[PDB]
Design an enzyme around this catalytic site. Sequence first.
Site, short mmCIF file in Angstrom:
data_model
loop_
_atom_site.label_atom_id
_atom_site.label_comp_id
_atom_site.label_asym_id
_atom_site.label_seq_id
_atom_site.Cartn_x
_atom_site.Cartn_y
_atom_site.Cartn_z
N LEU A 22 84.77 8.09 -10.93
CA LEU A 22 86.20 8.00 -10.62
C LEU A 22 86.51 7.02 -9.51
N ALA A 49 84.88 5.24 -5.37
CA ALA A 49 84.06 5.34 -4.18
C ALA A 49 84.83 4.77 -2.99
CB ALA A 49 82.73 4.60 -4.34
N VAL A 83 83.16 9.66 -5.87
CA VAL A 83 83.64 10.81 -6.62
C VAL A 83 83.33 10.59 -8.10
N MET A 127 91.58 16.13 -11.11
CA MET A 127 92.96 15.68 -11.31
C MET A 127 92.92 14.48 -12.26
SD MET A 127 94.72 17.79 -9.34
CE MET A 127 96.30 17.00 -9.05
N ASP A 172 96.97 5.78 -5.29
CA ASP A 172 96.46 4.43 -5.12
C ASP A 172 96.07 3.81 -6.46
OD1 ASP A 172 95.09 2.08 -3.86
OD2 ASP A 172 93.29 3.15 -4.52
N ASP A 209 94.16 12.25 7.55
CA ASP A 209 93.82 11.14 6.66
C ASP A 209 94.78 11.09 5.47
OD1 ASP A 209 92.48 8.92 5.85
OD2 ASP A 209 90.69 9.97 5.14
N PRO A 246 97.68 6.94 0.15
CA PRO A 246 97.72 7.03 -1.32
C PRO A 246 96.39 7.39 -1.96
CG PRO A 246 98.98 5.14 -0.59
CD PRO A 246 98.31 5.70 0.64
N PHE A 265 91.22 16.28 3.86
CA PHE A 265 91.74 16.53 5.19
C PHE A 265 90.65 17.17 6.05
CE2 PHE A 265 92.43 20.82 3.64
CZ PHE A 265 92.94 20.65 2.36
N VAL A 278 88.69 19.62 7.55
CA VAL A 278 88.39 21.05 7.49
C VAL A 278 87.08 21.30 8.23
CG1 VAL A 278 89.23 20.75 5.14
CG2 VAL A 278 86.91 21.60 5.51
N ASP A 332 83.17 14.00 12.84
CA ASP A 332 82.38 13.19 13.76
C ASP A 332 81.21 12.51 13.06
OD1 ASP A 332 84.06 14.06 15.87
OD2 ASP A 332 82.85 15.89 16.08
C1 LIG Z 1 90.72 8.37 8.82
N1 LIG Z 1 90.87 9.76 9.32
S1 LIG Z 1 90.09 10.31 10.68
O1 LIG Z 1 89.64 9.18 11.38
O2 LIG Z 1 91.00 11.22 11.28
N2 LIG Z 1 88.73 11.14 10.11
C2 LIG Z 1 88.73 12.18 9.12
N3 LIG Z 1 89.95 12.46 8.57
C3 LIG Z 1 89.98 13.43 7.64
C4 LIG Z 1 88.87 14.16 7.19
C5 LIG Z 1 87.61 13.91 7.73
C6 LIG Z 1 86.39 14.69 7.26
C7 LIG Z 1 86.47 15.56 6.03
C8 LIG Z 1 86.56 15.14 4.74
C9 LIG Z 1 86.58 13.70 4.36
C10 LIG Z 1 86.69 16.11 3.64
C11 LIG Z 1 86.82 15.78 2.27
C12 LIG Z 1 86.94 16.74 1.29
C13 LIG Z 1 86.94 18.11 1.61
O3 LIG Z 1 87.06 19.00 0.55
C14 LIG Z 1 88.32 19.24 0.05
N4 LIG Z 1 89.37 18.91 0.84
C15 LIG Z 1 90.61 19.14 0.35
C16 LIG Z 1 90.89 19.69 -0.90
C17 LIG Z 1 89.82 20.02 -1.72
C18 LIG Z 1 88.52 19.80 -1.24
F1 LIG Z 1 87.51 20.13 -2.04
C19 LIG Z 1 86.82 18.49 2.94
C20 LIG Z 1 86.70 17.48 3.92
O4 LIG Z 1 86.58 17.91 5.21
C21 LIG Z 1 86.55 17.00 6.25
O5 LIG Z 1 86.61 17.56 7.33
C22 LIG Z 1 87.58 12.89 8.71
F2 LIG Z 1 86.43 12.58 9.27
#
Ligand SMILES: CNS(=O)(=O)Nc1nccc(Cc2c(C)c3ccc(Oc4ncccc4F)cc3oc2=O)c1F
Lengths: 254, 256, 305, 291
Positions: D32, D34, D40, D104, D110, D148, D151, D167, D169, D175
């Site tokens: 899908l 990268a 993904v 989805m 995007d 984060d 799009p 987001f 979590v 980090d």
């Molecule tokens: C440029 N932004 S930033 O510099 O602020 N850095 C960061 N921003 C945002 C997040 C993170 C890390 C992260 C990521 C990337 C992550 C991805 C998927 C996830 O699964 C699902 N999520 C939602 C719905 C369904 C899922 F299955 C959990 C995740 O959990 C996370 O924590 C960052 F590092």
Amino acid sequence: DWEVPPSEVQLLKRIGTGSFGTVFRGRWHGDVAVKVLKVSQPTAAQAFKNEMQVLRKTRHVNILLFMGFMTRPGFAIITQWCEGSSLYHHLHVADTRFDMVQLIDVARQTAQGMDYLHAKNIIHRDLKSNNIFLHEGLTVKIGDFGLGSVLWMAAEVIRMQDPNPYSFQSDVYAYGVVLYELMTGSLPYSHIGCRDQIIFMVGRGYLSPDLSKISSNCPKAMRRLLSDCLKFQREERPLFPQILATIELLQRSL
Amino acid sequence: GDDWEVPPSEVQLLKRIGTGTVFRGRWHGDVAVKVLSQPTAEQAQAFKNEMQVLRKTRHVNILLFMGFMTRPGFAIITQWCEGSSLYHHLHVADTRFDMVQLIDVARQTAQGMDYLHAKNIIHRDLKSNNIFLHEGLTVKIGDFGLATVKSVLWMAAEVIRMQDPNPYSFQSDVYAYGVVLYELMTGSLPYSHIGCRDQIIFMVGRGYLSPDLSKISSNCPKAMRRLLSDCLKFQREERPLFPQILATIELLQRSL
Amino acid sequence: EELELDEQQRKRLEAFLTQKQKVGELKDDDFEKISELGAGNGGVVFKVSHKPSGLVMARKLIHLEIKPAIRNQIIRELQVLHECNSPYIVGFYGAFYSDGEISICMEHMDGGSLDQVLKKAGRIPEQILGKVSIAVIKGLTYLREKHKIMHRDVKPSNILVNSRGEIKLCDFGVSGQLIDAMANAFVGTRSYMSPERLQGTHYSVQSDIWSMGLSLVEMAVGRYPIGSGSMAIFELLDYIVNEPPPKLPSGVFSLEFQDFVNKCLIKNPAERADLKQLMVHAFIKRSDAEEVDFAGWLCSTIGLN
Amino acid sequence: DEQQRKRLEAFLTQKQKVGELKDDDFEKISELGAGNGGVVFKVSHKPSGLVMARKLIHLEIKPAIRNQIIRELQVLHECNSPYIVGFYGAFYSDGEISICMEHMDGGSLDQVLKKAGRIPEQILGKVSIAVIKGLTYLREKHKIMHRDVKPSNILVNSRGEIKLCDFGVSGQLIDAMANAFVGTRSYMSPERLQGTHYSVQSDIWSMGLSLVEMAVGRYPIGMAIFELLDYIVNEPPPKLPSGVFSLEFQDFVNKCLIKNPAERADLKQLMVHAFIKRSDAEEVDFAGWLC
Ligand SMILES: CNS(=O)(=O)Nc1nccc(Cc2c(C)c3ccc(Oc4ncccc4F)cc3oc2=O)c1F
Ligand SMILES: CNS(=O)(=O)Nc1nccc(Cc2c(C)c3ccc(Oc4ncccc4F)cc3oc2=O)c1F
Ligand SMILES: Nc1ncnc2c1ncn2[C@@H]1O[C@H](COP(=O)(O)OP(=O)(O)NP(=O)(O)O)[C@@H](O)[C@H]1O
Ligand SMILES: Nc1ncnc2c1ncn2[C@@H]1O[C@H](COP(=O)(O)OP(=O)(O)NP(=O)(O)O)[C@@H](O)[C@H]1O
Ligand SMILES: [Mg+2]
Ligand SMILES: [Mg+2]
């Protein structure tokens, strides 16, 4: 290009003088070994540059690392600095304790390096335990190839009559004497004091290494491989693809 | 040049090591085979570079190039290193290293980099992942896919900005070496709590963020801290080159 | 009877032993090089000055990779040379090990070896070779009678001369370990070895007598007589064992000298002459009576080196 | 509503038959996309018979730090919302972390923006509503942030659903993913780019920049990434052209791209904004426009 300006290299302690030249421990981007060739007046020169093109063809962990050459003021070869001792020193000077598992490993690594050289169409011409370094006390490094002592010379090299006396098989016989050192712990003809007698007999076939000194702990397949490498007729001696495969298959059956 | 090409019939691939993709293989003994299949016009010039850069390296602290394969695709054959990467030793396995060893690894890494710069090679991607401790003793610098002839944790600010004349330089390699020094002396990675990636990019690029030298171990000598900070300087013009780095390390080594 | 010294010989030997007492223990730092005298298959020889006593010596350096015990035994076996005091044997000051080199310090001979003299002279005259033949026979007899030692390496490069007219022997097998350690050598270019030794007999002075006769022929005609044209060591070793022995030309050299080398070059060691027969041979008896100014011929006609 | 309540209960029913996820239970369908730290893939889970989106993230970390991230994401089992993508499981194996989530079939906006050229304003109103509702769900029900919004992280499907993904979590995964390569685009608020102090108001900035990008089909700031970061910190924000878009939608993005986070609108103010209440009244065939 691999020529090095002599201003970039600092020569330190002399280490010794061999048949080709004198080795110094030097400094050129770290510790290096610098072999300064015998003659100073450069006749012809291109042969040196041609020999350097042979060393340029080698990139193997069991082959001493060529690093560069110098054409001024004289001809010199720059190689990696081996910390440790030669296989000759470990076997006949320091009397280092090796198990048979380690002796076959050294024999395997030496065959690994020779198989690479012959696959690159390189005849060593001067293989012996003095030119085998146990770098870090672990890895075999073969040096002074394509640039000797009678104990590692084949009969056809002693005679200098047959066509092409230096060959893969003459290297195999030299490797066989190295095997004799590893399996017996001593040099061939341990108490034959006359140099000329050792020469004339071996060249005619009247004398050969004494396989009765081969330690009992040596596997029978190793003794047969050893004797095959020491055969008088060069045509009957195995090539290193067979030698290496024989050792590698023997090791898997410990 | 072409004398280093190896036919695929001579090479055997064994266990996949990771991701191009690296295999432990057999070609006149243990080797490493990095499979980088129909090449685009530029990646051919790229493979023409990593191979050409590697063909110019003959040093004990540089990963030993052994050959290349053109079929089924482009591939690079190197020596097989026994052990782990410096990243693995410091940030994964928690390997117990003496201070004399850490200085020695710092010295050997500077030894290889000094060789590369003497050959007009800018590695452009020096990091702890690309430094291998062969047999737990000898530093082997690898990953020359971005090297040239003439992540962000190891990136100098002028390279992160991409505005100044010739961003990649010897000094940008020196900063990357400085971050490696930070790993050796602190046992951790820089900016090990700031979560925002772009923040690190903008802050480091502007100078608002730097590796925290307060995490330097107590047994790290003062001369090593100054060499560390001098290699991490914001203005590349003030960072020392590897000949001076070697003379500094060889000086502090001479007296414990 | 023929191990006896004349008044000049006995004065020179006691003079050497007097100079020898003031030497003592030898160390590397006490030596300074004057010039390099030559090199061989495994050794290189320097003309050196011993600073503490002011004596000039010849320092042979032999490189050997051997166990420390074998090194100590070689040094310990060379102490026999302190008892090898003869007008036909080169003197000995001491032997020591340093920087992987066993150093053998001996009496300096300002005339060099007859292999160097032959290259200058082209041919060594028969009257000179008569005095040479006498010194070798007396030198071998002294080694066999006084120490029961065989030479095992008689050749022109090991027959040394000096400006006082002395003819002395050097480089003989006093240390059996040094003989073994120097067997691991590189291929040579010549051989003065007897065919019985090239085949495997137990060592006997008859081999040295063969080596003397082969040396006499070379120095008499100015050419290495074994082989053809050039040849390699093995082919030369083949001639010695199989082909008939060499001989001096008939026209110029005396029948006495011709018969002397033939009895030394008989290939069977039992029929070959021993050191008693050659001592009472016509050539030796004639030469010992002849008055030959050897010191003058060396200093004036050939020069010194 | 009634339809959303039935779909969530249907998803929760399908989620009960999942359980533990392991590497050997999957077969890949297609790739899908990268990004900076993950790729993904569309995968088929044979044990439950469900199609999922599998995100693979490579990480060489200490064993304790690896165990922390896996259970730091188990909070996603409580993030059940029509504006948040569902979660099946996450597991580590030999240096890479796999995250399994709901597939989805429409991809990210995007990808949809590249096909449409420009996204109509009426569609962006439905998008703006789901992002505000999705962020409000994460802030009140789970008291975290999104960190984060862009799009690439706004997913759609054939059924007309608009949900969010990727987001913050797992805080150490945040980090850990800081050790990444130089990105290609920037969506960070200037105060986030500048220093430490920030809040959820930056998510509003990131969607405001996302709305402008999807409205004109062009990355609106403008270059290497650092020059973009300097532009966000220095220059005033972008805005939609005057003649094309409505003044309600114009005023919406301007209050969402106000550089100061205190003067910028909150999720409470945007909920009762003129542009939001207007499009919620509109009847737009979102599923048909996507399919
Ligand atoms: C440029 N932004 S930033 O510099 O602020 N850095 C960061 N921003 C945002 C997040 C993170 C890390 C992260 C990521 C990337 C992550 C991805 C998927 C996830 O699964 C699902 N999520 C939602 C719905 C369904 C899922 F299955 C959990 C995740 O959990 C996370 O924590 C960052 F590092
Ligand atoms: C070709 N024939 S062979 O193959 O038998 N090799 C050998 N032949 C003969 C002897 C040896 C070993 C030997 C050597 C070479 C030697 C050299 C110098 C030396 O100093 C003095 N010498 C005489 C007088 C005064 C001295 F100070 C003592 C030595 O004592 C030695 O024992 C051989 F190896
Ligand atoms: N790369 C090297 N690193 C360390 N020591 C070395 C190296 N190469 C040679 N040496 C040493 O230098 C000395 C002389 O070596 P060399 O000139 O090769 O003589 P040799 O190996 O004994 N005989 P030959 O190789 O035929 O000339 C020996 O003590 C070797 O161990
Ligand atoms: N005591 C000495 N005084 C003067 N010159 C000497 C002395 N010993 C040796 N030489 C010279 O040094 C040269 C080289 O000596 P050497 O290394 O013994 O060569 P070699 O005799 O031909 N080989 P070898 O079989 O060991 O005797 C000889 O040819 C002599 O000219
Ligand atoms: Mg050597
Ligand atoms: Mg001599």
